[model samples]
Target: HMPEEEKAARLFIEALEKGDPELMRKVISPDTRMEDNGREFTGDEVVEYVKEIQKRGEQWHLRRYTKEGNSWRFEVQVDNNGQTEQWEVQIEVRNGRIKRVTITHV
Candidate 1:
């Protein structure tokens, strides 16, 4: 059986794939921070960024994930037009909510 934290992480990834910003808020802690492409953004900003990407017609699909300590690392495949990209993200969890995120493009 998967651990509860892993289940929570999977749920979080599902919310992200569904483009539910409200669910993003619920899954992320108030103090959560995100670092992406050398830039840092707060939790709310991260949500907005995801929305922007979605609005641009980019689709994100979760391919796999792994647990690392209190954090979960997600491997995602993103498609923009006919081009596909892969990325990995690490999300730190606290109290069942994401406290931090760091994304790396692969």
Candidate 2:
């Protein structure tokens, strides 16, 4: 059986690809924190960011997923305005909800 943490981590990425705010909310904690590159964002801001991605018709692919210590790490490549950028994403899940996310350019 797949662990809940793994499932949550997967769903969080899936939600980003699908640009589903409700789905994002379903998997993230109330006070979820997010960092993109060196910039910080709140849970609500992350949702807005995803919304903008969808508006711009951006696409993302999940390239890797693995567990590292207490966090789940993922590598994703995103197509943004015809430019592809790779990102290293790490998420910490608690109580089946994602509590923190850190994303950096790779």
Candidate 3:
């Protein structure tokens, strides 16, 4: 089993791939906010945005993980219905939950 902090990161991606709000809620904190591409969605709006994702199928490959204090950084390779997306992600964690997430597409 992974630490809630680590588990949260993995869960976040899984949630995105499937657009599962239940799974996402497990990881997302009340303070949650996200920067998708270049646009910003704060708090529950981030969850709503994720819930809107639609894809035929998706897969996730985590490339890197770095933990710094209460912040986490991740590099990911994602299959978004056959179009590949490389993501640079940053998260702020508090008490084993995610407080914020920022994603930049590469």
- Per-model TM-score on C-alpha atoms: 0.84, 0.90, 0.73
lDDT of candidates 1 onward, in order: 0.78, 0.84, 0.74
**Best-performing candidate as measured by TM-score:** 2
Quick one: ranking by lDDT, best first? Answer: 2, 1, 3
- Considering only N, C-alpha and C atoms within 3 Å, which residue pairs clash in candidate 3? none
Q: What is the lDDT of residue 57 in candidate 3?
A: 48
Residue 16, model 3, lDDT: 75
Q: For residue 75, give model 3's deviation from the true position in Å.
A: 1.8
Per-residue lDDT of candidate 2, residues 6-61 (tens digit): 99889989988887777777766658889987778786787876787788888878
Could you give me the TM-score of model 3 versus the true structure? Answer: 0.73
- lDDT agreement of model 1 with the native: 0.78
- Candidate 3 lDDT tens digits, 1-106: 7887777777887787666767776667667778878788876776777666643345556788898677788888877655888878888777776777888885
Clashing pairs in 1: none
